[PDB]
Amino acid sequence: DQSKPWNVYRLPKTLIPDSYNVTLRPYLTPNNKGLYVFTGTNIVRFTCKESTNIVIIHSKRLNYTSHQGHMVALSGVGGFHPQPVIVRTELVELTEYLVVHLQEPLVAGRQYEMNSEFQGELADDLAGFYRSEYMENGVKKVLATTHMQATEARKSFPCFDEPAMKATFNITIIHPNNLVALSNMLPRGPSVPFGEDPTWKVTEFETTPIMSTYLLAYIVSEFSYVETRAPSGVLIRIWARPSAINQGHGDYALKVTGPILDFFSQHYDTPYPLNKSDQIALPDFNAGAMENWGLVTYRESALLYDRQSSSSGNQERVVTVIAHELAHQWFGNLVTLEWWNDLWLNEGFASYVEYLGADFAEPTWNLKDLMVLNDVYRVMAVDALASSHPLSTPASEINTPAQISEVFDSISYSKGASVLRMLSNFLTEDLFKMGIASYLHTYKYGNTIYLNLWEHLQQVVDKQPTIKLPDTVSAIMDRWILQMGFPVITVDTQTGTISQQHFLLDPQSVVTRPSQFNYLWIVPISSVRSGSPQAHYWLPGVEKAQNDLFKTTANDWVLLNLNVTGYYLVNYDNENWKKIQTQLQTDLSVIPVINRAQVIHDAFNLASAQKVPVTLALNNTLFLIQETEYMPWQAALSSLSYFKLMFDRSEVYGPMKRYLKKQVTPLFNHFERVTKNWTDHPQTLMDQYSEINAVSTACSYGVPECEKLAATLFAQWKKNPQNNPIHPNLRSTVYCNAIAQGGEEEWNFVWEQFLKAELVNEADKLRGALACSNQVWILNRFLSYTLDPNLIRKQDVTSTLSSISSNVVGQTLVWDFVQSNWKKLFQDYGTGSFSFSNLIQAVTRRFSTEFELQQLEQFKKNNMDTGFGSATRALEQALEKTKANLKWVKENKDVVLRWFTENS
Amino acid sequence: PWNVYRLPKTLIPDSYNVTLRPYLTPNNKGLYVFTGTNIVRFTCKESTNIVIIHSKRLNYTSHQGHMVALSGVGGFHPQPVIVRTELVELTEYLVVHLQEPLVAGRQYEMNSEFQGELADDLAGFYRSEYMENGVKKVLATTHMQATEARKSFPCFDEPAMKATFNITIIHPNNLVALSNMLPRGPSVPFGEDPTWKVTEFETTPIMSTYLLAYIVSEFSYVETRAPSGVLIRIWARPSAINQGHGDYALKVTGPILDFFSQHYDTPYPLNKSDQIALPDFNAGAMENWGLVTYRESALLYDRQSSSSGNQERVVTVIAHELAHQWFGNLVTLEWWNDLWLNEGFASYVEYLGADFAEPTWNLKDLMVLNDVYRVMAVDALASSHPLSTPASEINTPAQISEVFDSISYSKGASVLRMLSNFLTEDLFKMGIASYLHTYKYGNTIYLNLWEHLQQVVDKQPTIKLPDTVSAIMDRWILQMGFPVITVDTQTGTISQQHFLLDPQSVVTRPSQFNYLWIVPISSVRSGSPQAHYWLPGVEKAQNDLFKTTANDWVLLNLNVTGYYLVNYDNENWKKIQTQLQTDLSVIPVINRAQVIHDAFNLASAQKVPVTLALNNTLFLIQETEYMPWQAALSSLSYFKLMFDRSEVYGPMKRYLKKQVTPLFNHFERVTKNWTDHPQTLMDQYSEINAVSTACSYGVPECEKLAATLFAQWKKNPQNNPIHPNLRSTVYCNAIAQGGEEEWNFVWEQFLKAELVNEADKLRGALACSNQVWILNRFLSYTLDPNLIRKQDVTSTLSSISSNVVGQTLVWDFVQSNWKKLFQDYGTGSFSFSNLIQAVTRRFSTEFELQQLEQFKKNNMDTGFGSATRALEQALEKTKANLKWVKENKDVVLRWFTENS
């Protein structure tokens, strides 16, 4: 009954919390029933802003101890009549409410305190207050940890669990005397014994700042740490398993965390306000990392680093994730989204700002350039769908916890970053950061919506003469924030005519989301004419214009969007494309490296949408035979992976592989020479990445010299496994190829190494390579292990299922397994973020036939009893993509076959 | 009446004149067609104002306002008056509506002028094609069985409506026409066009429509005369005849025909028996009286390139078709529900004929593996059917087509083998001879047979039965299934019960005998024979023949002559197991196959623990005979289907590898490094299973043999160094361990392969690829009749499906291409039901059962045609498989692991 306030998914605006006291006691040994439990009490102090006879507060999977026949007690602060009288308390499970029914309405303007006493499960579900486990020598260790985002604080204590209901939190932790408690703040004093039980201690923490419930954290463990003070005086500690800390696996995080934090404080003119910032690595963690204010939590694989055994890509991951989480200390913690429909205000800012902090940390890596591959091109695939969504989705469309979990997606993260990058570029970053500092000073300890940003940027633009815009910030940026998608910008170099239209992967798909701007953008457009920079141009919100900047003669070409600073694709007339192709084949260095990736990426996007012939995208890969840079090869491999997914079960695959083998063999041989036969690996991060791509691609497509290298390294490893001779950058390729080329013996050896792998970086590589078996029975045995948490942690299941489905033989096995174990998978991941939508996308990627479309529709019908939870949009996108795939394969299978045959 | 599938009995034909003219080039509509005329002469037995006659996909040239003409033969008072004629497509009728009833006792002639397609559909009058040098050659040929004669001319197309047939063929002057009989004279030029000739054939004997045949081709022949004087000719593509590929069939055909004439004291009545090999043919072979048609793979034989199994196939199929000249042609089933009267006899008698031609091979013993154990898997289901199925269940052409199945063929053979054993063969054949003499040129019911058998039994004193022949044989004919005979050796208690693969299959088919049989039971005690015993039609009995002491074991059903399973108390099983480990030679080789086969069936159906069945395979490490290894590999193929996608498969492979490696080494020694293969057919077969099994389960020196032999062949393709007996394994294993290069080489060899024996081995090996993209590309080729002939599609699909990577690839393909496959095979025999069984046999999970049910109801508008029972059997088996895997996966993993 949606007329009742306790049956709708937004809290009343009538009661506003001020502060919370929460006391928690985890029990880290199971009870007589085999459960791990925690007990707690809390006090919520709120103000009645508007008269009401009910208290609606969030509560999820908590059992309450009743006091006077009621689940809570309630009183006005400091006596004052009338005192409230509870008629009854009820739990409403669907909307995750505790409802307190009062005999009289509360008094507007007064304060009340509600006391509860509760019990919950320290489950292995990675949500709320939960448990994490690890082996140390012989012993199974169990610890207690939290993850509140988005809607899980209510699972550890009753609270007004929405991000705009900020409060202060007074945390007390009751814990065994041999364990340490951590929280957002420092303890108020030394821990004293629990009077009721001296084998237990009590640790009480300083009051948090005004903050959102989803940012609370508390942890009880045996962990150790390493410690430094940042130049600013902020205390930095890196916490982890004692084995990890003693091996130095926390040292790299300790190196970069304090400097990045201080960089952000200075760069945005807003000092980090707390006295410390703990980073802690958890063995069981759903997301990867979480920005809890003062106590940032990480997957081990995102915080720990072994300078002998972790790869270069592992190290990039650590500094990027740390920079991301520290960026949240401003964008999310100090200033917070008003509601989850504006998630990009937190996640888009943090995903853009991570590159400035991580580039500060590791300037020689040139990390900023990877933003095009890692974010822009990551999200453009889904943002070309009619079933995408805008950065700022209308709020009443992101209501339920499943829909909230859903929007933690590539739009909110990576399109968020892409649009802020573009804004920063055309404003200049020095101007951008002044507007942001204004934004942050105005809204600190409060909440914002998309509009509040643009005033502060407009003022800095208006107060200086150099940088000017053809419109207001709000006119330009609203078009990027309130409507989904992005334009393709098409140039006729014979007339200079320039036009825009909403880019749709399937031109026959029906866009039903209306746009007040009719899917037109105001587009900033940089360009070069045969390498020479041109005047900057803005395309106004018009379908078509003309400018001689984009007209050429027979000896000149133009190239739009240098460095792909703007969030759009570019298409040209056929003659311009030919001139670009000739330049790439004559002297590729004339085209900047990012734009070499652009002409590959955009042509393949355009081909899949019937806007260029598929042979033009393929012709754009010919020059790779002389390219040694990482990014253009990575763009080609990512584009061609759509071809792999569409064709690796068909007659096209043979000719495909022979083409890729031909294109990559000189790159493989180039690295064999410059690394002196794989003994002296390259110096720059980019060249190391290019080397890894050369080795992975050469081995995947049958370069016998790469197959020899992998076989030889693996055979050497297996002769003495206490010494690993495989460079970590090469391990995934070597492990995968040894399993692919071998049988049960190689699989079992790798599985044994996995079971004893102490370092998660190494375990991850071993686990991934196990998906490379060509034996159905071995893949299905592997699949059975994923349902055993003694073998595969819950946090790794979805990643493992994805890797197995990437295997062409595992495609049908994982599809069948997901369908056969649906109910378990839905319970485990259906209300969480990332994993379940990742899984739906991974298992359906290949679908391209009428039969497979019908089977996906049947799958949807078979599971209407559960629905699709946090993968509901993902399933609609999978349907749209499958329909597009089916038509594209039918229209291009024969031309693609012919092209690979002729250019091989 | 025209809406019911059986003909009325009011009008009975006497004779037919049919003139057919095939056009072997397409017409202005792009079709290959034949034109024809016929005259059907029949007698009105009962007055009726309608003529209902069969007609299928024939277009008529009307005359005088009607689609046929109807004359009275000497009628003259009122000649019949046609009001209306119509075609009724569903029941495949042409219906003539008359103004007045036809007159009881008068004779009438119906005259028709028609056209039909010479389609590539392998049914009726159809076309077949082959390449010769560069030229595509097209010939016209027939296959009428069961209900396709109606697709070549209107006729009363039921087998008890026998008639004589006067065939005329108008054909191009460079081609020869053949039919059942010899021509009445030299061909004469077609007056209207002298590039065509006219060949008219002698009148056939009184016979069924489904046995008529006529062929127009450029084929060559070799010729001989049987010692009895019957002319024998073997016809095939000229290239094949010129290379000698018809010579082996020329050697054996005449002698086998004469053997049957003598053995049943009933002379073949025609002056010739042509055998002809067709490039496109659905069944394998067909017994048309005087003109027996064959797949090339069932008749042709190359001394240098065909294998030993290929040669056994030829002599056995020839013997089967010649057996039909008696069992089907001379005497014919009354209706298709009693098909076993034709093919049960043929499938049993083929062994006597083949044994006569090749007495050193010992082919009679192979009937236990090839027929008894083949059918026992299906006959252990609630969805089986009796040998004599109630006629109303066998009504439509789809139901008729489906009943050409392992029950009618292999249980029919098994039951008549039983009968021939417990009364002797010499007595059996005298009773058959009586039966044949009495009902020649007519049709029979099972009850006609028992009488003639009873007469011969009653004429001698030495063979005595516990009841009449009809009483005994009714239990094996009229109710489905077979008993498991259980022996408690501690007490001599012997009991019977209907054997059911899943104890919760719900038997809804009632039997008037309550599923009890009268069972002939042979036995030995520690190797030496006991007296014979008959278990009466009772659930339970006691006899000391089956009571033993601590130092004695018994064994029932010597050489598995009887159609039943045997189970014992655990103590007897252990003693039999000890005997196999002490001296396996004491248990006759066929019963060594029995103890493996029956235990595995018993294990699947809860009557023994699965570890008993697995323990009965332990002695194979010392066995070198073909038959017990073949029984084990056939029983274990169920374990492979159930487990080759699970953790169980690793240990199961390690166990098979252990058991077979000394047999492989044994053949590596006795063949002198694979240069001198065994002299005996049985030992050749044992060698083939050793190599195949060793390579399949990873004996590294078998893998080495195959890859080396294949590479050497590929280097020098004009010189094949692989002995034909080993090609299937070597080709498959080299494909499995190689990639596109190996696959593409085998495919081009296949496309150019002239000898179907060799094409078949190449084609089967292409299913061994472990590359999804290669298997899917292969699947796409099966839709192109320039690449895979229609006669080979379901074979290829089944082969790909057997590949564990091919399992879901074929399942998806069949569902996706349902419409064409249903059209091509859904109303014919063998192919469609084989396909359904093949693609589903792995199903063992709830999810797979749900997909099967969804498949059924996605197609219930079409139905499943001649795979309708097959689908119900697949549903029953899948449900049994789910429970069986649930109940046994852990014990089976443990046993394979512990036994290495």
* Cα torsion A434, A440, A441, A447: sign: positive
* Residue ranges in A538-684 assigned as alpha helix (H): 574-587, 593-608, 614-619, 630-647, 653-674
B641 and chain A in contact, CB less than 8 A: no
Domain edges within chain B: 1-217, 780-900
B817 and chain A in contact, CB less than 8 A: no
For the annotated catalytic residues of B, the residue numbers are 321
Query: In whole angstroms, what is the distance from residue B747 CA to residue B741 CA?
Result: 10
B contact test, residue of A745, A775, A817 with most B CBs within 10 A: A775
Residue type, position A425, single letter:
N
B804:A851 CB<8 A = no
Query: Among the CATH numbers 2.40.50.140, 2.40.30.170, 2.60.40.1910, 3.40.250.10, which is that of A487-586?
Result: 2.60.40.1910
B647 and chain A in contact, CB less than 8 A: yes
Is the separation of the CB atoms in A607 and A646 below 8 Å? no
- Residues constituting chain A: 904
Candidates A649, A849, A850; nearest CB to B772: A649
Query: Among the CATH numbers 3.30.499.10, 3.40.50.300, 2.60.40.1730, 3.40.50.20, which is that of B1-217?
Result: 2.60.40.1730
Could you give the 3-state DSSP secondary structure of residue B231?
Answer: strand
> Smallest Cα–Cα separation from B496: which of B547, B544, B546, B538?
B538
Q: Breaks in chain B at C–N > 2.5 Å: after which residues?
A: none
Q: What is the resolution of this structure in A?
A: 1.9
> Smallest Cα–Cα separation from A746: which of A759, A729, A734?
A734
B647:A777 CB<8 A = yes
- Helix orientation angle between A685-700 and A704-719, rounded to the nearest 10 degrees: 100
**Phi and psi dihedrals of B758, rounded to 5?**
-80, -45
Question: Considering only the top CATH level, what class is B780-900?
Answer: mainly alpha
Nearest Cα of chain B lies from the Cα of A778 at a distance, in angstroms, of: 7
- Does B109 count as an annotated binding residue? no
Element (H, E) at A75: strand A72-76
Query: In whole angstroms, what is the distance from residue A403 CA to residue A387 CA?
Result: 14
Q: Tell me: cis bond preceding A617? Omega within 30 of 0 counts.
A: no
- Does B284 count as an annotated binding residue? yes
Residues in chain B with CB shorter than 8 Å from the CB of A850 are 816
| Domains B1-217 and B780-900 equal at CATH topology level | no
Angle at B49 between CA B43 and CA B54, to 5 degrees: 65
Candidates A647, A776, A850; nearest CB to B805: A776
Beta strand B82-88 with B93-98 is: antiparallel
Q: Tell me: cis bond preceding B189? Omega within 30 of 0 counts.
A: no
Tokens of A796: 């790794």
B890 and chain A in contact, CB less than 8 A: no
Tokens of A224: 């150790």
Residues in chain A with CB shorter than 8 Å from the CB of B650 are 744, 777-778, 781
Number of H helices and E strands in chain B, helices first, is 30, 31
**Exposure of A67 by Cβ count < 10 A (0-12 exposed, 13-18 middle, 19+ buried)?**
middle
Query: In whole angstroms, what is the distance from residue B708 CA to residue B716 CA?
Result: 13
Is the separation of the CB atoms in A431 and A464 below 8 Å? yes
Question: Considering only the top CATH level, what class is A1-221?
Answer: mainly beta
* Cα torsion B430, B431, B437, B443: sign: negative
**E strand spans, A137-288:** 139-147, 168-176, 180-183, 192-194, 197-204, 218-221, 224-229, 235-240, 276-282
Please, which residues 315-344 of chain A have a Cβ atom closer than 8 Å to chain B? none
**Phi and psi dihedrals of A188, rounded to 5?**
-75, -20
- Of A96, A325, A691, A880, which residue is the catalytic one? A325
A748 and chain B in contact, CB less than 8 A: no
Candidates B646, B815, B854; nearest CB to A781: B646
Query: In whole angstroms, what is the distance from residue A519 CA to residue A511 CA?
Result: 10
Nearest Cα of chain A lies from the Cα of B788 at a distance, in angstroms, of: 17
Residues in chain A with CB shorter than 8 Å from the CB of B648 are 777
Nearest Cα of chain B lies from the Cα of A609 at a distance, in angstroms, of: 25
| Rg over CA atoms, chain A | 28
**Phi and psi dihedrals of A752, rounded to 5?**
-65, -40
Candidates B780, B816, B847; nearest CB to A651: B780
- Does A292 count as an annotated binding residue? yes
Eight-state DSSP code of residue B409: I
Candidates B647, B649, B847; nearest CB to A819: B847
A642 and chain B in contact, CB less than 8 A: no
Candidates B772, B777, B854; nearest CB to A809: B772
CA atoms within 13 A on the CB side of A195: 0
B898 and chain A in contact, CB less than 8 A: no
Question: Considering only the top CATH level, what class is A223-365+429-466?
Answer: mainly alpha
Please state, in angstroms and as integers, the Cα–Cα distance from residue A792 to each residue in A227, A662, A764, A783, following that order. Answer: 32, 39, 11, 10
Residues in chain B with CB shorter than 8 Å from the CB of A744 are 650
B773:A648 CB<8 A = yes
A780:B812 CB<8 A = no
Nearest Cα of chain A lies from the Cα of B660 at a distance, in angstroms, of: 20
Query: In whole angstroms, what is the distance from residue B440 CA to residue B207 CA?
Result: 10
Q: How far is CA B606 from the centre of its chain?
A: 31
Please, which residues 68-87 of chain B have a Cβ atom closer than 8 Å to chain A? none
Please state, in angstroms and as integers, the Cα–Cα distance from residue A500 to each residue in A503, A546, B218, following that order. Answer: 9, 12, 69
**E strand spans, A93-229:** 97-102, 111-121, 128-136, 139-147, 168-176, 180-183, 192-194, 197-204, 218-221, 224-229
Is the separation of the CB atoms in A130 and A124 below 8 Å? yes
Nearest Cα of chain B lies from the Cα of A742 at a distance, in angstroms, of: 11
**Exposure of A410 by Cβ count < 10 A (0-12 exposed, 13-18 middle, 19+ buried)?**
buried
**Exposure of B688 by Cβ count < 10 A (0-12 exposed, 13-18 middle, 19+ buried)?**
buried
A contact test, residue of B641, B648, B649 with most A CBs within 10 A: B649
Query: In whole angstroms, what is the distance from residue B873 CA to residue A769 CA?
Result: 41
Angle at B35 between CA B29 and CA B38, to 5 degrees: 155
Residues in chain B with CB shorter than 8 Å from the CB of A777 are 643-650, 804
Element (H, E) at B232: strand B231-236
- Does A328 count as an annotated binding residue? yes
| Rg over CA atoms, chain B | 28
A851:B815 CB<8 A = yes
Query: Which residue is closest to B740 within chain A, CA to CA?
Result: A654
Residues in chain A with CB shorter than 8 Å from the CB of B780 are 651
- Burial string for B396-416 (b: 16+ CB within 10 Å, else e) reads bbbbbbbbbbbbbbbbbbbbb
Angle at A674 between CA A669 and CA A677, to 5 degrees: 70
**Phi and psi dihedrals of B43, rounded to 5?**
-115, 130
A777:B645 CB<8 A = yes
Element (H, E) at B19: strand B11-22
What technique solved it?
X-ray
Please, which residues 843-872 of chain B have a Cβ atom closer than 8 Å to chain A? 845-847, 850, 854
Nearest Cα of chain A lies from the Cα of B804 at a distance, in angstroms, of: 7
Residue listed under structure tokens 């929405």: A162
A777 and chain B in contact, CB less than 8 A: yes
Query: In whole angstroms, what is the distance from residue B391 CA to residue A396 CA?
Result: 68
**Exposure of B614 by Cβ count < 10 A (0-12 exposed, 13-18 middle, 19+ buried)?**
buried
Q: How far is CA B156 from the centre of its chain?
A: 26
Query: Which residue is closest to B652 within chain A, CA to CA?
Result: A777
Domain A778-904, second-level architecture: Alpha Horseshoe (1.25)
A587 and chain B in contact, CB less than 8 A: no
Candidates B645, B770, B773; nearest CB to A654: B773
A819 and chain B in contact, CB less than 8 A: yes
Please, which residues 786-815 of chain A have a Cβ atom closer than 8 Å to chain B? 808-809, 811-812
* Residue ranges in A742-809 assigned as alpha helix (H): 744-756, 760-769, 776-785, 797-806
Nearest Cα of chain A lies from the Cα of B646 at a distance, in angstroms, of: 5
